[PDB]
């Protein structure tokens, strides 16, 4: 009814203004709850009418923020769930409760993701190890803060220049006692000679195995490929997107340049061009291994998870 469009518009301008909420698993739960509220507050005779409907509001929600892919891939996963149920019921009236219980299964799958990565986390950490991460992500800091329960090693949290969010990760890992080293973003190849492996997170996994992540990590992937150290991308499966990199140049999210060059710099701000991209592109050849809640996967295996979670007819949304 009307309250549905109230909540939809609130979600749309919440995504338009800032990051609401902060982390992504709450946002995926909000998206799945909004989608179950959309499928429980409407009337349809064919599944294709709800399919066109969900495609239209998915277009609206990704037109709210084109840089954040979690809402779009959640809409696409719900679309493939509806397509699978229509295909298994076609070969009618019990479809709605089937999509409801499938969304409930996806919610139980999604709430236990980080702790499944933590359960499989002990298969990648040995004693007295040098780890280097970038940015801030609760999956990687939970990974390290529970992997330090039985192992003793070292984590070097490098800050990122637009928003130094690695200080929060450093003070969260130092409370667990993992001998955290804090550095800048310019010393990575200065310290790549001693880092044994790179365990980072990401924002969005692309269809070809590539990934967008917090900025400055393509440099880290290049240095780790130069030193031949393996890369661990601790990423869930709601950051998996079918959006190809070269697609209408809408890759990077540019923010205000105040954090790079402040407004008190002088009259020299008029004749300067300051850009601040908070995301960066990493090709799959600079990635060794992805770690999802179902296990470890290769970058040569992202197409199979793509075809298992998404449909090629819904890539345009």
């Amino acid at each position: 009814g009307s309250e549905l469009s109230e909540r939809i518009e609130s979600f749309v301008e919440t995504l338009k203004r800032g990051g609401g909420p902060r982390s992504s698993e709450e946002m995926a739960r909000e998206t799945l709850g909004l989608l179950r509220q959309i499928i429980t507050d409407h009337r349809w005779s064919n599944a294709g009418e709800l399919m066109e409907l969900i495609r239209r509001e998915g277009r609206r929600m990704t037109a709210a923020q084109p840089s954040e892919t979690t809402v779009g891939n959640m809409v696409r996963r719900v679309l493939k769930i509806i397509r699978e149920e229509y295909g298994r019921l076609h070969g009618y009236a019990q479809l709605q409760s089937n999509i409801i219980e499938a969304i409930n299964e996806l919610l139980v799958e999604l709430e236990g993701t980080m702790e499944n990565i933590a359960a499989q986390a002990l298969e990648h950490i040995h004693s007295n190890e040098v780890i280097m991460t970038i940015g801030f992500s609760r999956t990687v800091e939970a990974f390290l803060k529970e992997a330090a329960r039985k192992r003793k090693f070292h984590v070097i949290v490098a800050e990122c220049a637009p928003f130094c969010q690695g200080h929060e990760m450093a003070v969260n890992l130092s409370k667990a006692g993992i001998e955290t080293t804090v550095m800048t973003d310019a010393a990575i190849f200065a310290v790549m000679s001693r880092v044994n492996k790179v365990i980072i997170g990401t924002k969005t996994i692309l269809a070809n195995g590539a990934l967008r992540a917090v900025t400055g990590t393509h440099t880290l992937a290049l240095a780790a490929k130069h030193h031949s150290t393996p890369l661990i991308v601790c990423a869930p499966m709601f950051k998996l997107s079918p959006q190809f990199p070269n697609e209408e140049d809408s890759f990077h999210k540019f923010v205000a340049p105040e954090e790079v060059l402040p407004f008190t710099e002088g009259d020299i701000l008029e004749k300067v061009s300051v850009h601040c991209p908070v995301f960066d592109y990493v090709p799959p050849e600079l990635i060794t291994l992805f770690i999802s809640n179902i296990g470890g996967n290769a970058p040569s295996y992202i197409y199979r998870l793509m075809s298992e979670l998404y449909h090629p007819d819904d890539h345009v949304l």
Partner: protein
Amino acid sequence: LSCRFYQHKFPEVEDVVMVNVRSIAEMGAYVSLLEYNNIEGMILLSELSRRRIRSINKLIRIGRNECVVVIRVDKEKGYIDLSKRRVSPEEAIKCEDKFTKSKTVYSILRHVAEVLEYTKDEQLESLFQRTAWVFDDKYKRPGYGAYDAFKHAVS
């Protein structure tokens, strides 16, 4: 000091019970029946969902309470087969409300026995049978009848 929630020690067939997962094995997920004095049950790997499931840990969540329908029970062998596939969201909400009311009645009688200082489990079970299970057998409703009788006795 603990006891079961109802006058029966084992649930009936197709009875949705509230359990908590304790461990995960290859045969299924070991659970504990919270309303039957923590007896051991098993949710089958084939009954965890209606969709093809690659691994048991994707939907187990050891430590979380869940409503599961009983498929097979054996009082002699001690085998209790449970299923999360058969339960509906309406039946899950009904089982959640029934477990909440039965847990409130259990906490009330546990506080009453702590005030009476009945450290023995047999005297506490006799108090259970004299307070809640008598009303549950009189009204023919386990959990609903005792909570309704206590809500009427509060007034």
